[model samples]
Target: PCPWEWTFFQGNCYFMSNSQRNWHDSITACKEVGAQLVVIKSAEEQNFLQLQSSRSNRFTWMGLSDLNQEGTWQWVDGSPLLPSFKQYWNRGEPNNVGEEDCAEFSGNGWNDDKCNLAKFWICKKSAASS
Candidate 1:
């Protein structure tokens, strides 16, 4: 199999695709590749994502959205959203402009977006080394 694009961190293999994709399309693409959209399970993981965002110049989609449950952000794994774990938005962002249900990393250390808007994204899968 092809190696993942990003390095392994916190027991997971990480990758960031520069190609923009909507939330559903991104999720489907990950699935087709035998993985799922990235999920931040802990502070360490979140920090890792933040680091990646800092290094990149473009926004990246993350596995977070309010789709099918507007106002209630949830991970693709169906886990409840944790406010404490949120990377936060740039003041008043995520206004659900045009009813955007997806989330993306703004590359400026914050998140602001609609899933369908199409942006590069991060993809993650568990690592066997853990």
Candidate 2:
């Protein structure tokens, strides 16, 4: 259902990044590989990703962001944030601290970070159709 080196969870294939890049660049990196930045749609997925990101000891960009309309966060696929997912943000986060607009997976949760900052990222795509 997934390719070598890509971890399969549920019905998707995830690629854990070995390098770091800014939010914009990270998006390009994923798209270049026929996937998109990982978008967590449920607590199950969130928890799984939380573990992976925690192991990195570094923030990992996700598909969530508020870059286009400030506080209005949306996934790269044009989906709006779910209320349940909103609760995943660390306390007092998305604080727009220093113009934070990109969302990154942090220890056990999510955080809004400056888009220009370099960080690890995860790319995700559906399982192979066949």
Candidate 3:
């Protein structure tokens, strides 16, 4: 089961934030709530996240970045992105545009964004046992 106000899918629970915050602050916010930023690991999970967003072009932070090493994107849980999962990125994105090192879900795909930009976010945690 999921906690109140959290959505459950595939054994995990997700919480979408209504307030906007910078990427680093967003990470801290999730951790304070007993979760981490949501990490996309599968097509279905990606789809589920996309559907949860109520608007198109809304910038919502996901648990992904290449801050430690350029071109090496890793999720918040410390897993490197798989090669096959590259399809989730928006065309011509991660462009390193203006030194974008963080990732966000926007307009149906992922986009690399600057870490200081204030945006909404999602948090993820394991579902609680019934």
* TM-score, every prediction: 0.85, 0.94, 0.92
Question: Which prediction has the highest TM-score against the true structure?
Answer: 2
C-alpha positional error of residue 124 in candidate 1 after TM-score superposition, expressed in Å: 0.8
Q: Per-residue lDDT for 60 in model 1?
A: 79
Q: Order of all candidates by lDDT, from best down to worst?
A: 2, 3, 1
Reference-based lDDT, each prediction:
0.74, 0.89, 0.87
120, model 2: CA deviation in Å?
0.4
Clashing pairs in 3: none
Q: Is candidate 1 or candidate 2 better by lDDT?
A: 2
* Candidate 1 ranges beyond 4 A from true positions: 1-4
State the lDDT of candidate 1 residue by residue for 79-113, as single tens digits.
98788765466566668877878777775455646
Backbone-clash count (model 1): 1
Candidate 1 to truth, TM = 0.85
- Order of quality (TM-score): 2, 3, 1
Cα deviation at 1, candidate 3, in Å, is 3.2
Consecutive 10-residue window with the lowest summed lDDT within model 3: 50-59
Per-residue lDDT tens digits of candidate 2, residues 1-130?
A: 6887788999999989889999989999998889999878889999999888887687899998998899999999999998878888998897998799999988878999999999999999988731
TM-score of decoy 3:
0.92
